[PDB]
Design a protein around this motif. Sequence first.
Motif, PDB file in Angstrom:
ATOM      1  N   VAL A   1       0.855  -1.184   0.000  1.00 55.14           N
ATOM      2  CA  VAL A   1       0.000   0.000   0.000  1.00 55.14           C
ATOM      3  C   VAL A   1       0.896   1.241   0.000  1.00 55.14           C
ATOM      4  N   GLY A   2       0.306   2.416  -0.275  1.00 60.60           N
ATOM      5  CA  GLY A   2       1.135   3.613  -0.228  1.00 60.60           C
ATOM      6  C   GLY A   2       1.894   3.811  -1.523  1.00 60.60           C
ATOM      7  N   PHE A   3       2.862   4.704  -1.481  1.00 63.20           N
ATOM      8  CA  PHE A   3       3.551   5.059  -2.699  1.00 63.20           C
ATOM      9  C   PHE A   3       4.387   3.920  -3.270  1.00 63.20           C
ATOM     10  N   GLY A   4       4.769   2.926  -2.456  1.00 65.28           N
ATOM     11  CA  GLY A   4       5.514   1.832  -3.090  1.00 65.28           C
ATOM     12  C   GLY A   4       4.595   0.699  -3.487  1.00 65.28           C
TER      13      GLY A   4
ATOM     14  N   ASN B   1      10.018   2.513  -6.740  1.00 68.38           N
ATOM     15  CA  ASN B   1       9.203   1.319  -6.548  1.00 68.38           C
ATOM     16  C   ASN B   1       9.956   0.364  -5.632  1.00 68.38           C
ATOM     17  N   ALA B   2      10.047   0.719  -4.356  1.00 62.76           N
ATOM     18  CA  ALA B   2      10.713  -0.191  -3.424  1.00 62.76           C
ATOM     19  C   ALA B   2       9.886  -0.308  -2.153  1.00 62.76           C
ATOM     20  N   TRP B   3       9.991  -1.445  -1.479  1.00 63.55           N
ATOM     21  CA  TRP B   3       9.143  -1.718  -0.320  1.00 63.55           C
ATOM     22  C   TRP B   3      10.032  -2.338   0.762  1.00 63.55           C
ATOM     23  N   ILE B   4      10.130  -1.640   1.878  1.00 64.43           N
ATOM     24  CA  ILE B   4      10.909  -2.153   3.023  1.00 64.43           C
ATOM     25  C   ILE B   4       9.923  -2.548   4.111  1.00 64.43           C
ATOM     26  N   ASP B   5       9.751  -3.846   4.368  1.00 69.35           N
ATOM     27  CA  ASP B   5       8.618  -4.323   5.150  1.00 69.35           C
ATOM     28  C   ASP B   5       8.980  -5.389   6.173  1.00 69.35           C
TER      29      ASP B   5
END
Length: 346
Positions: free
Chosen positions: A26-29, A160-164
């Motif tokens: 969700v969000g910008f990434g 386009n990156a996601w740190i989760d």
Amino acid sequence: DNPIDSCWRGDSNWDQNRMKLADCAVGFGSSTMGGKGGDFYTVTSTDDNPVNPTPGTLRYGATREKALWIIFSQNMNIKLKMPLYVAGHKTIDGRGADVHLGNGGPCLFMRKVSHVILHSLHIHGCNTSVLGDVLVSESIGVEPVHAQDGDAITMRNVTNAWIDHNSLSDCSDGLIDVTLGSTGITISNNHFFNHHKVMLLGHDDTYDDDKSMKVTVAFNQFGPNAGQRMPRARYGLVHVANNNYDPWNIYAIGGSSNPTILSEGNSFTAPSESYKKEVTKRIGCESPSACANWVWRSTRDAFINGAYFVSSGKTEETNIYNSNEAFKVENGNAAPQLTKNAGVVT
């Protein structure tokens, strides 16, 4: 849990469907694919050869040009010998193992790449690296890399990156550094702790091209013993939503060069000291009149132990996301519940 976790933990067993995770950002990434569609790659060795990585090691899978979903065959403490540059279209997925990176060596770097997911890793003890040659990627080959800060995760010109769901602590410099035109990033469900300078979004007051940076910081646990910069932003736009904050050391949210900061549904617990009660910190103001132009909003935040947020700009409804990005933000009283599973998945 929360809108992200509900998507892949509600009617799915991740062990038998690891790539479902990639449908749930969700969000910008939210467009981040990681190595979705690619093959699974298993790390079977803790070794590291920076200039000529061998099959089975983390650096070999991370530098391939093809899309890969990287997983780990066993618990592993990995000490890298040089900064690890992670190619685009990669997922590094720590679910199902206890993976610890840093441990006195340099950590993770992304430069001029897209579609990277970093999930359920422990990263701590990252240290300053030494100037030296490194296999930047399979396609790029070996190149000299200057000495780098001991940041856990560094992004330069990344989209386009996601740190989760990572557990990030005790590094020499920062935990997450986002610079040079990076945008389309979500930082979610992480546990940041035992660390002074946590998160830098935009590196210099000189680089106004960060005005296009868009970053979502959501459902993170900040603390205990997190010092400040949660985030510290410059020039661009940061949505800070449904995060939980333990007592900070200097401030919680701050920035310079007119960032737009949209704080919504956070829970802030202030330290005891009078001069630390303020959540916000503006740096480099030209004048109160000028700094009053910055749009720093607080919506449905919760404040404990005397915490307060100094707002600037007029009140307005959050209107920053398209249909592929939007997600529900609850009142700040819910943030402890929404962040109960922050940090690595077990």
